[PDB]
Design a protein around this ligand. Structure first.
Ligand code: NI
Length: 341
């Protein structure tokens, strides 16, 4: 049964609520982004309206084969009327096509649902500046001060330089990058760009990338593995046994693999700066784990909420335990007391 925090009071609306069969009274279903935890339940057989971004809409059509009559894309930064209710989609700075949703309720109440998001100061100059928010449904994934990580720009600098050095020292080295869902595309794109290669990948992944409205994408990616010296593999294959196997398949083109695993947070961030990171090495193979997050750090989160000064806050991640729910109310109270709202 659909939980409370996926319902929008006073409306016929739910958010990211596809795995509970027919939800009593829902006249329209909102989808924040194309990640499996959120889209779970959707298929070709779904027959109620779905509202989403354009890019999310391309993925529903081409990857889950949802029928074109039921997909309702909306443009960002635009006031739209849906079943007699005003709504706005805003970029979440999460993965491609990911959005936050502003609802203007008939009774005068105003609701922000973040979906998944990495808070940024640029969000303070959106359509959010212009008015009050009464309830904030919040992505609280890293809501604890021990969760620190560097900026995206710092991580991408490290990866580029790491790659460029190794391949310049050894022209016969192959670079590999792990993936399992959409997001974090910049890692493999930036690396290929400094190396003057296209990125090689499977047909199922090529298809996926074609739905993302990336500029000049056709110049950047390819299905011809042999033409490329930056390869994508599924994340699970990024270990010593999986890579040794993959090297055999390249046929004496390459004598060395350097591989990158994009992770979220890991406990090694409590002690080690990004500059100081080192790889796990076995023979002619090396594997770097790098902390590229598309979710807000603790400080990023704290700033956004303190700026927004919402009247009530509802969490959407880490809700499943009493300890978690308790810890989150304590941080919300300190933030409220520190900023005076
Ligand atoms: Ni997500």
């Amino acid at each position: 049964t659909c939980p409370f925090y996926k319902k929008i009071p006073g409306t016929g609306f739910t958010v990211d609520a596809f795995q509970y069969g027919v939800v009593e009274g829902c006249t329209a279903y909102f989808l924040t982004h194309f990640h499996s935890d959120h889209y779970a339940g959707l298929s070709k057989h779904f027959t109620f309206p779905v509202y989403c971004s354009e890019i999310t809409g391309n993925l529903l059509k081409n990857k889950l084969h949802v029928q074109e009559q039921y997909i309702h894309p909306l443009p960002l930064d635009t006031e739209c009327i849906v079943n007699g209710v005003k709504v706005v989609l805003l970029d979440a700075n999460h993965c491609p096509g990911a959005v936050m949703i502003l609802f203007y309720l008939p009774n005068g109440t105003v609701i922000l649902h973040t979906g998944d998001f990495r808070a940024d100061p640029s969000m303070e100059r959106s359509l959010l500046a212009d008015q009050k928010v009464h309830m904030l449904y919040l992505d609280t994934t890293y809501c604890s001060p021990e969760y620190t990580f560097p900026s995206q720009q710092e991580v991408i600098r490290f990866a580029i330089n790491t790659a460029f050095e190794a391949v310049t020292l050894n022209p016969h080295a192959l670079v590999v990058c792990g993936t399992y869902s959409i997001g974090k595309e910049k890692v493999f794109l930036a690396i290929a760009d400094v190396l003057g290669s296209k990125v090689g990948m499977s047909q199922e992944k090529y298809k996926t990338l074609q739905c993302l409205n990336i500029p000049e994408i056709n110049s950047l990616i390819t299905t011809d593995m042999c033409s490329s010296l930056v390869h994508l593999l599924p994340m699970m294959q990024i270990n010593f046994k999986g890579l040794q196997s993959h090297l055999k398949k390249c046929g004496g083109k390459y004598n060395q693999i350097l591989a990158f695993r994009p992770t979220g947070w890991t406990h090694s961030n409590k002690f080690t700066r990004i500059a100081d990171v080192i790889p796990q090495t076995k023979g002619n193979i090396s594997i770097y784990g790098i902390p590229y997050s598309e979710h807000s750090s603790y400080l990023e989160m704290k700033r956004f909420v303190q700026w927004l000064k919402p009247q009530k806050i509802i969490p959407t991640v880490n809700v499943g335990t009493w300890k978690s729910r308790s810890t989150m109310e304590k941080y919300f109270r300190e933030w409220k007391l520190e900023a005076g709202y």
